[PDB]
Amino acid sequence: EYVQFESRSLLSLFTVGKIPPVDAAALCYWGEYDPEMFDWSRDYMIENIFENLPFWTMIKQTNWGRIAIIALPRFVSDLYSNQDDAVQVIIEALEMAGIIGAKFVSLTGLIPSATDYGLAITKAVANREDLPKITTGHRTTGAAVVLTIKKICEQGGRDLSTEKVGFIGLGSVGMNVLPLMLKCLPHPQEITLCDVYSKLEFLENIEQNLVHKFGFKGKIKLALSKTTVPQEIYDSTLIVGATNVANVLDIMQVKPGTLIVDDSGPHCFSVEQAIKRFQEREDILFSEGGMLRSPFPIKTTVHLLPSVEAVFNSNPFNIMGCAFSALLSSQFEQLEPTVGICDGEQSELHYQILQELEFEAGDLHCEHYVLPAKSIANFRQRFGK
Amino acid sequence: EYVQFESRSLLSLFTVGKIPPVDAAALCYWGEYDPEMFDWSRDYMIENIFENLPFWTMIKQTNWGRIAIIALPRFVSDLYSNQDDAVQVIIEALEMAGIIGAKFVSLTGLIPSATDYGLAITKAVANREDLPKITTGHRTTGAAVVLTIKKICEQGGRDLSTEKVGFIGLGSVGMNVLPLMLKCLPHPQEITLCDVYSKLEFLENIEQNLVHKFGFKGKIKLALSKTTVPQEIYDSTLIVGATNVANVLDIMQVKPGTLIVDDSGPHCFSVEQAIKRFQEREDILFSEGGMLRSPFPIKTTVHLLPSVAVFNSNPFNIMGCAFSALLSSQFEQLEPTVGICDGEQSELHYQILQELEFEAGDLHCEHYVLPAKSIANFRQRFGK
Ligand SMILES: *SCCNC(=O)CCNC(=O)[C@H](O)C(C)(C)COP(=O)(O)OP(=O)(O)OC[C@H]1O[C@@H](n2cnc3c(N)ncnc32)[C@H](O)[C@@H]1O
Ligand SMILES: *SCCNC(=O)CCNC(=O)[C@H](O)C(C)(C)COP(=O)(O)OP(=O)(O)OC[C@H]1O[C@@H](n2cnc3c(N)ncnc32)[C@H](O)[C@@H]1O
Numbered sequence: 184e185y186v187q188f189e190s191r192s193l194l195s196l197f198t199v200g201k202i203p204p205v206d207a208a209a210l211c212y213w214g215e216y217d218p219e220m221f222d223w224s225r226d227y228m229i230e231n232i233f234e235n236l237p238f239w240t241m242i243k244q245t246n247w248g249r250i251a252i253i254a255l256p257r258f259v260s261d262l263y264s265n266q267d268d269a270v271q272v273i274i275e276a277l278e279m280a281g282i283i284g285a286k287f288v289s290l291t292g293l294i295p296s297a298t299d300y301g302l303a304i305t306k307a308v309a310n311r312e313d314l315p316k317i318t319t320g321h322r323t324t325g326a327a328v329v330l331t332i333k334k335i336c337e338q339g340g341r342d343l344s345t346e347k348v349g350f351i352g353l354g355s356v357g358m359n360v361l362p363l364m365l366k367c368l369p370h371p372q373e374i375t376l377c378d379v380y381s382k383l384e385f386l387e388n389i390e391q392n393l394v395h396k397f398g399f400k401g402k403i404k405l406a407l408s409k410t411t412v413p414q415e416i417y418d419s420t421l422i423v424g425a426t427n428v429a430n431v432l433d434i435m436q437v438k439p440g441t442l443i444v445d446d447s448g449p450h451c452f453s454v455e456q457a458i459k460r461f462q463e464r465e466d467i468l469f470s471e472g473g474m475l476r477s478p479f480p481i482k483t484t485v486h487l488l489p490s491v492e493a494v495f496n497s498n499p500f501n502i503m504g505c506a507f508s509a510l511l512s513s514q515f516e517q518l519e520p521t522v523g524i525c526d527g528e529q530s531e532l533h534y535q536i537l538q539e540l541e542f543e544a545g546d547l548h549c550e551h552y553v554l555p556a557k558s559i560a561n562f563r564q565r566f567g568k
Numbered sequence: 569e570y571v572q573f574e575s576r577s578l579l580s581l582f583t584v585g586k587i588p589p590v591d592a593a594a595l596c597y598w599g600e601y602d603p604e605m606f607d608w609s610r611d612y613m614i615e616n617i618f619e620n621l622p623f624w625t626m627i628k629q630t631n632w633g634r635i636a637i638i639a640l641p642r643f644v645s646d647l648y649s650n651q652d653d654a655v656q657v658i659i660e661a662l663e664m665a666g667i668i669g670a671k672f673v674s675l676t677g678l679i680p681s682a683t684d685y686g687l688a689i690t691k692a693v694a695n696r697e698d699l700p701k702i703t704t705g706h707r708t709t710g711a712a713v714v715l716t717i718k719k720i721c722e723q724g725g726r727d728l729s730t731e732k733v734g735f736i737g738l739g740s741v742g743m744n745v746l747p748l749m750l751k752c753l754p755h756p757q758e759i760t761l762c763d764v765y766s767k768l769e770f771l772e773n774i775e776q777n778l779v780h781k782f783g784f785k786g787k788i789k790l791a792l793s794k795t796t797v798p799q800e801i802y803d804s805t806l807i808v809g810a811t812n813v814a815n816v817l818d819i820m821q822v823k824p825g826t827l828i829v830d831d832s833g834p835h836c837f838s839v840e841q842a843i844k845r846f847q848e849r850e851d852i853l854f855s856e857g858g859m860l861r862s863p864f865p866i867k868t869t870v871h872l873l874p875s876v877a878v879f880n881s882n883p884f885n886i887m888g889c890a891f892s893a894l895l896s897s898q899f900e901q902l903e904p905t906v907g908i909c910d911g912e913q914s915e916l917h918y919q920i921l922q923e924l925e926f927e928a929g930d931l932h933c934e935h936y937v938l939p940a941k942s943i944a945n946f947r948q949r950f951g952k
Contacts, residue, residue, distance in 0.1 A: 191619050191621065192577075193580060193622075194579060194580065194583065195619075195621050196621070198659035198663065198664040198667050198668075199621060199622060199663050199664050200580065200660065200663050201660075233578050234580075235576075236576060236577075236580050236581070236584060237584060275585060275586070276584070278583065278584055278585050279583045279584055282583050283665070312610035353569075486613075506901070
């Protein structure tokens, strides 16, 4: 009904006028390469499975316009292993996106982290005016995470003002969330900042800004990670994750009653262990942080790659925040696209427009698993006020 | 080499900038469907193999620009039985062609014959301004045939002024050839006009134009067909075919020393029997008529449809009416042709081709090339 499978090439159908142009696009990639998960080398898959070409795989038709989902013919390790190659395949994808009508293109996942947050792309296309504008979409991602913090506190039966909040990963997304949360929601009583040892000075500057720029009056703690989070993080009652490193948090050690919002992909904790613990004990709440719930249902068209071949039954109201960011920039000129580490209060404009449009966070879920509403109510009966 | 196989979609490669745009396109179709498919239905091919989409299958890189070859997702019988659908899929292919750069698009094969010579396409594109221009390319086809007539007489040791010429099929292509032949080459001794019985009045008018308009002083004979060609046609020593019906001419009945230039597709005689007879007796010269020979080798990129001869192709050869779309984009005086146009711009095409050092392709029929030594034997037994 809201999900339609298309066996024919979306690009071919577009070029003969059988499907309309899109207004925006979002670039993704094929996860991570593991030699024990595939029959062939990395180079074989890139050349023969992905054909070294970007692949237009989905259309998301929202009330605010159409988004093409385009997959780069690369794994995440390829983006980091050669930034020049990453930029060149992204430029090939931007040329395709422009032909099919995109005006703005979102860089999802770790594409910003691997490309100087878009700046390496913008410099390589500065001499071109025929390509769509790029955005990391991270201000909208930041607002989706704050909306999820709001929702998981509501579903948990608690107020944020009583929480001890631990931030795991204070990179581009993480530092969009922390100031916006302080702007939009009641201040918690304690904030822990957790990142790797080499970012201690960076974290100490964040602590200064918490006191003197963002008006935070509660307790502040710094927690340095090595291969995993230090044990102090398990003192937090709300954990907010935005790491580029999987499984740094042991979900079996969070205390009963803990709320977890995580935009990390893969998650900073084990999804299968979190689900098992929730099914057995119903004593945590956990969710993706970057997903928005549109007030109107979204029509999704899906064209699977035959060689690469949870789509059906997927929630038709849900859309990823940074993907939707590209439509926000075309609909509302004030919501300018973002490249580089962008510091400022413009995230509040993303939060305000999302609320005026009656977006909220997606219902609590983690990859394939939706937390059933009765189990959430059981958690709330035991661990709320 | 000059032929390059590409396993990836040309359309995909173009949209990422790995293939440059083209200057023109030519539409074709997937031959004829019949129980020769032995394993798959017609609707299964159209719905699941062609996917009801045009298929960009080749690029030809010439010294005068690039042309995309695009196959319509239909068989030839589908074009005649349903002119409405044929126009609809052609307009879909024109939108793709415009996206990949084509300014002019040729309609090859029987597409003009089944679409009122492009008039039906022009009608349905109405006021749309986002599509490339179409052309039948038949004025360039006519120039290729006249160039082949010139070439087969060169190599046969014969001169046209002493020949008895029989035209089989006087449609769009055939009537581009005849006036142009009279204008560019020495007038033959005799001309026979052969078409279907229902076109008698049309042929009678051609005869009046031959004498009073084109200044032909030789003998003119009309000889209609009811199914196969009448016996009068076998009195001809040069036969020029352009029918939309196959196997109306019996190659076994032609006299020794007969020259045959055929643009029919499939041919109006049996290709198998023509080869067999030529090998055993070497008493006929026969060739395609619509094939041009470029002075420079053409580089071809081929993307074969994954479901469904090319490397054995002459890299100098290019089909006349395909090339016509490139001529229209290069030379603004060679206007595109839609409908039965007649006219005498045909000389311009012929003159431009000679200017560019084009000639007819070497004598060949489909996959078979007539060996140059067997051509010399013919010239000994039947030339001068
Ligand atoms: S489009 C919306 C973006 N989100 C998604 O697409 C879903 C998940 N996909 C991802 O690619 C990533 O998980 C993120 C995008 C969420 C990473 O975000 P980003 O902010 O762009 O990446 P960045 O490299 O700038 O910061 C990452 C952050 O994580 C810290 N970190 C690494 N290891 C640790 C440990 N062990 N503890 C704590 N922090 C850690 C990095 O040092 C860095 O600051
Ligand atoms: S790129 C240039 C186009 N040529 C080709 O692509 C190669 C061959 N492909 C074909 O589709 C056809 O063979 C032609 C294009 C050569 C057909 O020519 P055209 O002029 O466009 O078609 P039209 O229908 O206008 O005329 C055909 C002609 O043949 C007559 N005819 C039919 N049956 C007979 C018989 N038995 N005898 C004599 N003539 C016959 C038709 O009445 C009709 O007038």
